[PDB]
């Protein structure tokens, strides 16, 4: 019935992702499009699969306040989380461990963007009116 | 075709500062923000 041209492989054309316990402030699709990084107000990052269960197979914790913005890193295995607890954090996705936590900002680290061609470098702009560029190593 | 009986009741989700802040900008001061996003209310 109604047979309207299933586009994707998702079980249904509208899927609601639940399990968070706070506002969800930013999300991101894996570069290879089969992961979800969801950063909530509950200072936690859910990792969902995009297909076949939509299983949140990992909840990464480690921020002490709302994780305001999440991107993935260009290869998809490392994650850049930015928060209100003044701390941006690099995590390994497959693993569940945090790689590098830089907290140089003085106030809430609102925004971040990791560079898509070149080195492992991401910008972060926070409440201190300072936009800071951050190289990985 | 309406939801409740005398209107439409819809779930909402904010952060708690916002209910209280708007409720007390109008509540105490008389004039606050419309919860619909359309301007401000009252005198």
């Amino acid at each position: 019935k109604e047979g309207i041209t299933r586009t994707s492989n998702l079980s249904a054309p509208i899927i609601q992702l639940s399990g968070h316990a706070g506002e969800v402030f930013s999300m991101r699709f894996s570069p290879d499009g089969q992961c979800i990084a969801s950063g909530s107000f509950d200072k936690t990052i859910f990792l969902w699969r995009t297909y076949d269960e939509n299983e949140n197979y990992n909840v990464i914790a480690g921020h002490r306040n709302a994780v305001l913005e999440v991107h993935w890193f260009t290869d998809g295995e490392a994650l850049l989380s930015c928060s209100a607890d003044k701390t941006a954090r690099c995590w390994d996705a497959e693993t569940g461990a945090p790689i590098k936590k830089m907290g140089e900002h003085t106030a809430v680290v609102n925004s971040c963007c990791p560079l898509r061609r070149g080195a492992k470098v991401f910008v972060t702009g926070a409440d201190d009116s300072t936009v800071k560029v951050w190289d990985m190593r | 075709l309406k939801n409740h009986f005398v209107g439409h009741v819809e779930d909402a989700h904010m952060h708690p500062i916002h209910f209280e802040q708007q409720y007390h900008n109008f509540h105490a001061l008389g004039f606050g923000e419309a919860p619909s996003g359309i301007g401000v209310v009252g005198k």
């Binding site: 509208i14 899927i15 609601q16 399990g19 939509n54 299983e55 949140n56 990992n58 | 075709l1």
Partner: peptide
């Protein structure tokens, strides 16, 4: 390390 997430199929509710 499956977390406390679920995904269920739901229509999107409409106000009229």
């Amino acid at each position: 390390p499956g977390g406390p997430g679920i995904g269920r199929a739901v229509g999107r509710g409409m106000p009229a």
